Each structure stands twice: as structure tokens, then as C-alpha cells.
Design a protein around this nucleic acid. Structure first.
Lengths: 136, 135, 134, 94, 38
RNA sequence: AGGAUGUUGGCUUAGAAGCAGCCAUCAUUUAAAGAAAGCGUAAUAGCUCACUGGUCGAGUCGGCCUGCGCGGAAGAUGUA
């Protein structure tokens, strides 16, 4: 599970998730999984989708993970009233905007990359699409 | 399937063989296993006869180049052509005993002389001796 | 109608031949010594394939063929067993000449129009069994 | 060889450019040389098919505007964030 | 009969049919492949 | 209608013959036919696919962008 090794602060504001994404094109590999929806990606979802793609291509070629869950999310335990300070950090998320490229793959045929990305997309809470590297 | 460049090349080659040969025998060969074909191929190579199954459309194109344009009508149904390029006949001969013996397929029309040859009367070619008989 | 690969001047055994065509209606001893009778001329220890041909009255005829490519290639490489992992583990050498010999025998049994073609098929086998042609 | 038909834009801005893309077109610009830059409109799907070929970004294209051919090269492309669409193209005079 | 929300062809012989507004999968080969969306 | 030859490819195994598994996947005759896509056998056999010739005779194939619909959709007094 991806997680920052250390942070300047432990807890962060909720914030908002407006706007479109940066890094909207395949920059390392040849095929990419681009998010068309908006939402959060927990570190477990990222790891689950990575394993689904890693096993799909039988550990072949190269795989990049363009996102990183750097935002901590706190929760209050059960049977606890409101107040008495912010909750404890439970997991980390990466904010996703439409157009964000999540994963990139290289070294495999396209027809195999589509199935690998299709298996991984089933683990993610946001709608995605298949993209390929283009001549800028 | 077969790109247009393919089929053009298939025609060209069948046509070039048609120029060199001297006796063409055409037959149906549907409903015969590949072993009996493989056997007929060793009998063709042995007897110096060139054997091809080719699309009836595609043969009509080869033929027209000369002098087999009588054979057009022989290209309705499954077609097997027999080009005796070295010596004449022997194919006409070979096909009939092979035809009779195997009671599958038929044999259509042959062609020598730039004249179509009728199914029954092919017995002419199928009895012409050796070259190599005039001595 | 059954096909076997039997040792030259040897026949009869139960796990080898017996049961196999024995459970089809075939007279064992007859085929045994007829087979051996005609395969006497084969070199010693050449495994030869025979196609046995039985008819409704349990009577039979058979054809003998040339030994398998794998066999001749085993003998030509002087080995006993093909590679367990052909083309990952190499287990020997036949010259182009040995290929050609085997090819002419198997030519009596091939479908190649030329020496070269037959030889290429034999090479195909030789590759298939991790023997290099050297 | 790629030839493109274009029309000069009547007005610029965010409001005008979004109306173009709603009308199955998209703006572009032609600069380079000593001439003044030229703002143009392009038919989207027709240009979208041409840019799908790798030589579109390497060869020299001709844009006929007011019946006048201009030889240019594709400089930069602004694609839609998540749709197979174009938003803007920079053309530099060859 | 498999009653699921996502019906798909499981082999070459599976056919998609819509009967009375219900997407169904009928297979002439494998009776296990019989599905209906529900 | 054909779907062949080396050949039951090599290894393994009691057997492993396209079809438990491992490795290889060449070559021939080909119109075409994978050292086999699925069923089948103790292993063969046997069925079928890929592929190709024939018949038919003008369209047929599968991706994208979008509009509107379908399923997914089970609660308690009574349609609600």
C-alpha cells in the first residue's frame, strides 16, 4: 500500500476536488488508463488494481503508477460523539480529476493491454478509459 | 483471405504454366480425401504433370490469355486443372482410371489443339501413346 | 485397424503388443512371427512402425513402414533419449549428411518432392527433439 | 499531403470558442514569420481523422482560407482532457 | 438458470435473446450457460 | 466437400497418439489444414473448430461520437 514515508503534518483539511487533471497523456509507456470520472483513490484500490494488471500480463513488460495517495483521511471510531478534536488517520487517498492518467503500460501488445486495463478498471470506483501514446 | 495483390500473382503463375504446357485436363475433385490427392500428386510429379486447384473466377482470367477460352464453361463447380507441361496426355489417361477407381468426382472437359474435349470422347487423349512410340 | 511401432525381430509381449491389438480380435502369435519373419532384414534394434489391418472375420494384413524420424535421429546422434526441453537443452549433432540419409529412408516414407524438402522435415523433427544439426 | 479548409474567426474569447466546439468546430491560430497571426476555425471531425496519422505532425500542410493556400506545420495541439476531441491547434507558417 | 445483473456470452454457442423485455442467454451446448438478467 | 504427410514431435507416464503436465512449434504435400480451438477415450478411436475449393448473388462486418429508452430495482394499515 502506497503511503508517504513521512509528512510535514499528520492531518489535512477535507478540501474540495474541483477542476480538471494535470498529466493527461501517456508519458512513459505506450498505453494508459485515463480516468474520466472524479473521486478519490484509496491506497488499497490502487494496489488492488495493480495486482489485477500485474497478474493479467503474467508479470511482463513495464507498469507505471502515475498517482500517489498523499492525502490522509481521518475517521472517528464508533460510539463517539461529535467534537473532541479531529479523528485519527485511517487511510490515504489520491484525488482524481477527469483526464488523469492513472496507470501506464509498455512492452505488451495492445489487445493484451486492453484486457489488463479492463481487469484493473473493475477494482476502481471511478469510470476510466483506454488511451494510447500519441505524437504531441 | 486473399488480397488483390495475391490473386493477381496467382493468376500470373497459372497463366505462365498454361503457355508452356500442351494438354490440359479439367476435373471435379470434390469429395476426395487428401491422402488420395497426395497420391495423385506423386503420380503427377512422376509423370511430369502440373496440378492445381484454383478459383473458377481466377482460372477464367488465366485461360483467356490463349488458347483455352473454350474451357470457360468447364469452370462451373469445383475445378481441378492438370497441366502436362512435359509430354502430352498421360494426365488425361491418369485421371480416368483414377476417376473410375475412386467413384467420387467425375471429370469435366479436357482441351488439346485449342479445341475443347468432350467428357466421354476424351478416350482419344487417354489412349495416345509415347513420344517414343514412333520408333 | 490399428497402428503400432514394434521392435524389429521382436514381438508378442503383453504390456507392449498383446492387449493392444489383442482386444480387437487379432491372432497374436501369427502376427508376431509374420512380423518378425519380414522384419528380420531390418538392422538390429530399429523400432519399426507397422499398420495392422483387421477384417470382420478377425483375419488381418499389415504394412511395415520406415522407422520413426525421432528414432533414426536418436541413433544418428548416438543418444538414447531426446531432450526433456528441446531447443532449451541441446543433445547433439547430426551432420547435414546424416539428415540426408535419414531423409532418404524416410524419403521412402515422406511426401517431399525433393531431397531438400524431406531433409528439411527431418530437420524439423531434429529441432523438435533438441538435437542440433552439426 | 494534407489540405485543410478554414474560415476566419469573427470573435474570440471563452464564450465564442465554446460555441464553436458545440457546433462541431474548433478554433486554431496561424503565426510565424513577419505576418500578423491569423485566427481560424476548423471542422473538427474532418481534422480529427487527419491528425490520427503520424505524418500529420511532420509534413507541411496547406490551409486554404479565403481561397488562399498557406503552408504551415502543426506546432502544438490542445486535446480534450478525457474525450477523443481537439480543442485548439497551433499552426506555424512553414 | 443463472439470474444475475450482468449476463454475458460464456462460449461460442451462447446467444443473446430478449424475450418480454428480459435479456437472456441461451446456449445450445452448455445448459450451465443459460442466464437471464435479473 | 476437404481439414493431409514426417508423426504416436521430444520429455514424462502404467498410458499421454493435437487435446493431464513440461519443452519445442518446425517442415512437407497443399486449394487449405494449428505439432491443434472445444467435446470425447484407460490410451487410441470418434465429433467439431481454425483454414480452404464449391454453391449463392449484393451487400455484409465492428469500433467511435451522441439522443431517448431496458435490466440492475425487495417492507411492513390501503392503490400510496
Amino acid at each position: 500500500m502506497l503511503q508517504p514515508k513521512r509528512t510535514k503534518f499528520r492531518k489535512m483539511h477535507k478540501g474540495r476536488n474541483r477542476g480538471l487533471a494535470q498529466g493527461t497523456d501517456v508519458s512513459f509507456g505506450s498505453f494508459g488508463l485515463k480516468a474520466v470520472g472524479r473521486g478519490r483513490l484509496t491506497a488499497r484500490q490502487i494496489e488492488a488494481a495493480r495486482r489485477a494488471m500485474t497478474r493479467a500480463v503474467k508479470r511482463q513488460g513495464k507498469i507505471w503508477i502515475r498517482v500517489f495517495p498523499d492525502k490522509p483521511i481521518t475517521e472517528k471510531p464508533l460510539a463517539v460523539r461529535m467534537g473532541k478534536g479531529k479523528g485519527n488517520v485511517e487511510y490515504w487517498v489520491a484525488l482524481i480529476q477527469p483526464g488523469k492518467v492513472l496507470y501506464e503500460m509498455d512492452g505488451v501488445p495492445e489487445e493484451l493491454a486492453r484486457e489488463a486495463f479492463k481487469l484493473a478498471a473493475a477494482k476502481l470506483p471511478i469510470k476510466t478509459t483506454f488511451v494510447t501514446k500519441t505524437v504531441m | 483471405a486473399l488480397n488483390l495483390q495475391d490473386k493477381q500473382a496467382i493468376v500470373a503463375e497459372v497463366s505462365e504454366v498454361a503457355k508452356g504446357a500442351l494438354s490440359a485436363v479439367v476435373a471435379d475433385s470434390r469429395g476426395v480425401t487428401v491422402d488420395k490427392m497426395t497420391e495423385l500428386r506423386k503420380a503427377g510429379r512422376e509423370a511430369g504433370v502440373y496440378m492445381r486447384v484454383v478459383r473458377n473466377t481466377l482460372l477464367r482470367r488465366a485461360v483467356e490469355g490463349t488458347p483455352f477460352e473454350c474451357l470457360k464453361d468447364a469452370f462451373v463447380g469445383p475445378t481441378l486443372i492438370a497441366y502436362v507441361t512435359e509430354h502430352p496426355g498421360a494426365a488425361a489417361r491418369l485421371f480416368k482410371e483414377f476417376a473410375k477407381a475412386n467413384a467420387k468426382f467425375e471429370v469435366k472437359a479436357a482441351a488439346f489443339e485449342g479445341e475443347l474435349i468432350p467428357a466421354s470422347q476424351i478416350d482419344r487423349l487417354a489412349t495416345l501413346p509415347t513420344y517414343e512410340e514412333a520408333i | 485397424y490399428v497402428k503400432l511401432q514394434v521392435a524389429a525381430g521382436m514381438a508378442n509381449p503383453s504390456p507392449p503388443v498383446g492387449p493392444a491389438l489383442g482386444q480387437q480380435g487379432v491372432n497374436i502369435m501369427e502376427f508376431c512371427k509374420a512380423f518378425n519373419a519380414k522384419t528380420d532384414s531390418i538392422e538390429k534394434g530399429l523400432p519399426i512402425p507397422v499398420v495392422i489391418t483387421v477384417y470382420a472375420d478377425r483375419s488381418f494384413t499389415f504394412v511395415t513402414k520406415t522407422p520413426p524420424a525421432a528414432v533414426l535421429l536418436k541413433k544418428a546422434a548416438g543418444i538414447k533419449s531426446g531432450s526433456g526441453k528441446p531447443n532449451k537443452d541441446k543433445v547433439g549433432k547430426i551432420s547435414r549428411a546424416q539428415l540426408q540419409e535419414i531423409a532418404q529412408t524416410k524419403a521412402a516414407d515422406m511426401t517431399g518432392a525433393d531431397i531438400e524438402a524431406m531433409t528439411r522435415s527431418i530437420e524439423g523433427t531434429a529441432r523438435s527433439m533438441g538435437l542440433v544439426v552439426e | 499531403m494534407f489540405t485543410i479548409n478554414a474560415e476566419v474567426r469573427k470573435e474570440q474569447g471563452k464564450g465564442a470558442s465554446r460555441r464553436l466546439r458545440a457546433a462541431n468546430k474548433f478554433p486554431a491560430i496561424i503565426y510565424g514569420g513577419k505576418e500578423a497571426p491569423l485566427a481560424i476555425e476548423l471542422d473538427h471531425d474532418k481534422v480529427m481523422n487527419m491528425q490520427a496519422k503520424a505524418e500529420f505532425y511532420s509534413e507541411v500542410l496547406t490551409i486554404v482560407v479565403d481561397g488562399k493556400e498557406i503552408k504551415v506545420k502543426a506546432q502544438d495541439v490542445q486535446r480534450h482532457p478525457y474525450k477523443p476531441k481537439l480543442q485548439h491547434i497551433d499552426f506555424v507558417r512553414a | 438458470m443463472k439470474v444475475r445483473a450482468s449476463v454475458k456470452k460464456l462460449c461460442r454457442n451462447c446467444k443473446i435473446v430478449k424475450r418480454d423485455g428480459v435479456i437472456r442467454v441461451i446456449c445450445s451446448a452448455e445448459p450451465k450457460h443459460k442466464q437471464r438478467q435479473g
